[PDB]
Amino acid sequence: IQCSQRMLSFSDALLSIIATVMILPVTHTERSVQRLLATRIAVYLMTFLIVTVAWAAHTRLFQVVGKTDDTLALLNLACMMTITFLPYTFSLMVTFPDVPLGIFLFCVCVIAIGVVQALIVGYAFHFPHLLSPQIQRSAHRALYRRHVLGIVLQGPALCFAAAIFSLFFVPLSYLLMVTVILLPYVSEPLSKERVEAFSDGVYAIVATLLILDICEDNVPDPKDVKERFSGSLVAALSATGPRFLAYFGSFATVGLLWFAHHSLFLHVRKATRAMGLLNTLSLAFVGGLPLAYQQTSAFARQPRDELERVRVSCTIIFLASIFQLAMWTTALLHQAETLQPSVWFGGREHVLMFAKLALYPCASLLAFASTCLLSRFSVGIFHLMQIAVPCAFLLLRLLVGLALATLRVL
Amino acid sequence: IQCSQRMLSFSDALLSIIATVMILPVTHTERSVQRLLATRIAVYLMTFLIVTVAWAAHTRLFQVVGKTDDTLALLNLACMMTITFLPYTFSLMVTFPDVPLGIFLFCVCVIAIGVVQALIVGYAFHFPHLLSPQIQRSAHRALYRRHVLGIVLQGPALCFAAAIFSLFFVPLSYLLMVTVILLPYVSEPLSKERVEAFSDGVYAIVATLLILDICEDNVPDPKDVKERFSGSLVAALSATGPRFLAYFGSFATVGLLWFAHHSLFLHVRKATRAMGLLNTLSLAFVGGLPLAYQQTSAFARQPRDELERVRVSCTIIFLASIFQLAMWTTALLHQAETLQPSVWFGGREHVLMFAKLALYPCASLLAFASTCLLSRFSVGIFHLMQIAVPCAFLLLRLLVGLALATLRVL
């Protein structure tokens, strides 16, 4: 039989994309404009959370299922196809909260996902040699199968209840639906490889969103160049320059955030559900960076507009990195089982890692405060941080050594 | 010191996105239409080939420098930031071969890639422990360093020469440019994990192009639905049904191709550069499937139109699969060095592996011949191939035995 690892990777390489799809409507967007933008942000966040919950269920499922073969791979592909429709169905439901057809479609999506997962469980247990070794030696194989089936089919059951009740009173259906996401929390390790794969996929997609847009839209047209720019191609490129600047900033920020994430996870011994939650929040907010940078690159009709956009960029960068730092703190709370020895309290790289993770929250906080105190140079300082933070990463060892030496003579 | 697996995987995801970026205009496409689409397809194929050459150079580089470091990771991020621009500048250069600015831009991009990689080499050799263990042993560290810089910089030099020549005679510049890819072939293992990661990224993005499109475009507007269908939302869904069917077909075909590729590579021990070439061709043609399914879902003004649309779809599937089959046969040609014993000639799964691969190209060829012989049912037969091939993959392990059973009674 097969080594399941690669297959799971592909699933993540799929789910990441499905998780991030609803970002694109946000970027392409221009009481009317602001409300619409906020609606798109809310829809994107909810879709990302839903896809993350589905991914968590998948990760647990294939944690139980150790090895795989042909039929398991095909059923996993079918499950992936069913999960791919969650963004679209959810968007339909939200855009049409009145008619029951939308909630019915979303509930059918969830039901299909859970049914495929239950079929996978049944096939795996019918061939115990596929299951993980601890499950194989589990004397509760029948009871364990019963419990796993209950867990997997709870979601579909609640969704079926919501669908039936939608024909009469939809609020009950909505409550039953949120129950699906609530109960698994209300009534554990996430295999590090799965978390790493999903996070890397999300980071890559978010980093290359803006170049995707640029290649799809900005490539000059010879007719346009000859007519509007009178054949001066360099003028045509300088016209779209701002999108290049925004992409440069987005790639810098997202790449350095991924660098901090990589440094953190290199020393993590054993992930946890709490770290999973915090990582999910961190990624959901990392998704916002391209929007912030697009807004920054755009014109500012009034000083207040530019100040507000700088505020938003700083706030997004903060929210993105603060949860990443909180992951590290939560790990420190269970240091013995969570983190490598080299990053324990007083460890050789403990302070270095702390600075590496806290570099972005602190810089963003200073930039945000600049708006409340130094509105004169506010935007400028923002630009400065965009160049300051990368440099500190190159010099991080020397910078931390300087800080420690300064504290020595304090 | 770090383990480079995750950093390489993230870089591979980035490069997959960059390579498959240029397909988006092809799908978004509607003597004028035909020529425009031909130009788009040529642009896409050349962009994919050039980005794969860049990825191949990257793979060799990070084969030589095994371990990594924070500063080296940042250098790699900088390298990716420039490799990401190859699509845009190549498209611009193809759009503006007349003016020297576009060729200069492409040239500076390639020289930037080369100089970043040269810095990586210099740093790796300034810290010998970062090199791969066998290289660390090499008594030729000096001469091998010189050779590595020679291979890395062969491009940059030729591109610089072409950029200089662009001001006087552009044909010489283009000849020098193509010499960059000519020389390495005219005057080796590709690390398997890199090949699997790149192929998984390609397949994952290609399978979900269509749903990505659907999420942004087909969500009905309530202001539109209320009028166009008097609140009949199901009418709106049925209006776009064909797009959903196109997505279903695209995902099924792409996922089953990924299943064949995964089963192939799980038995592959060392991917030879020939295998890399064949995989590049296979992925490049796998890119086309979304276009094929979009064309198939589109209306047919005349029977000739639908016939030709079936022909092109079948040709694309046939190419995408026959290249994998050719990779498999080339592997058989060196099974002793490349393939696991289990799939060697006369192996237990040898017949199973061969059938698994050859299932799709043969089906496409049969559906193609149906047009030349059975035009009456041709289109239906194509749909049959969309239904049969999935089941054939489910029942393959049985079906092959059935076939063998025939060869026992015959």
Ligand SMILES: CCCC[C@@]1(C2CCCC2)Cc2cc(OCCCc3nnn[nH]3)c(Cl)c(Cl)c2C1=O
């Ligand atoms: C030599 C250090 C360069 C480091 C990075 C690399 C990103 C990933 C690791 C390094 C990050 C970065 C930020 C930049 O700031 C963009 C602000 C936009 C603007 N416009 N006017 N003023 N500021 C610019 Cl410009 C550049 Cl080139 C670069 C890079 O290459």
Ligand SMILES: CCCC[C@@]1(C2CCCC2)Cc2cc(OCCCc3nnn[nH]3)c(Cl)c(Cl)c2C1=O
């Ligand atoms: C029951 C197993 C089927 C396997 C797959 C899954 C894809 C990924 C792994 C399995 C593939 C597939 C192809 C289809 O073909 C599309 C019909 C196009 C049409 N029909 N009428 N007119 N045009 C349909 Cl329908 C479906 Cl359901 C499915 C699946 O679920």
